[PDB]
């Protein structure tokens, strides 16, 4: 810790750092793609859900909002892109 690389820092330390504290502030949030217990229709849901999102018809509960990433319900799928 005298001379180091600020231009090319390791992502080992940079990914445990703060969202604003990376060399360029990144979003730490992602986007799912989800279905029902019984339905194929794919909802595009945000990783941290302030709203309680529904899958459209038959008025389901996909996720209950938290102080953070939404808490999903029982079982259903997810894909991070």
């Amino acid at each position: 810790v005298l001379v180091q690389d600020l231009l090319h820092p390791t992502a080992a330390s940079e990914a445990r750092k703060h969202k604003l504290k990376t060399l360029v502030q990144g979003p730490r949030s992602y986007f799912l793609d989800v279905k029902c217990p019984g339905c194929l229709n794919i909802t595009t849901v945000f990783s941290h859900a302030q709203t309680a999102v529904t899958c459209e018809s038959c008025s389901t509960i996909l996720c209950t909002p938290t102080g953070g990433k939404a808490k999903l319900s029982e079982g259903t799928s997810f894909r991070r892109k």
Partner: protein
Amino acid sequence: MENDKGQLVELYVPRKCSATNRIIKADDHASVQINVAKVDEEGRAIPGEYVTYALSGYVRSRGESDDSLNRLAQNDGLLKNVWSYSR
């Protein structure tokens, strides 16, 4: 330090720190100079022939000495796979 006609006028020219490039003064007795020994084939270092480094009172005190050598050593070549340039 030159002079009028180009005739050097000065009493002495001090030594930059190898780590900080900062002058080492006369009362700088905190400072340290390091002698690393050149070798022939299969070791057995040559007397009179050294690789030399200078670490002033500051860097030694502030705690970058061991690290500022590994920093320095690899470049002229001493060691490999020791000091990272990134944390």
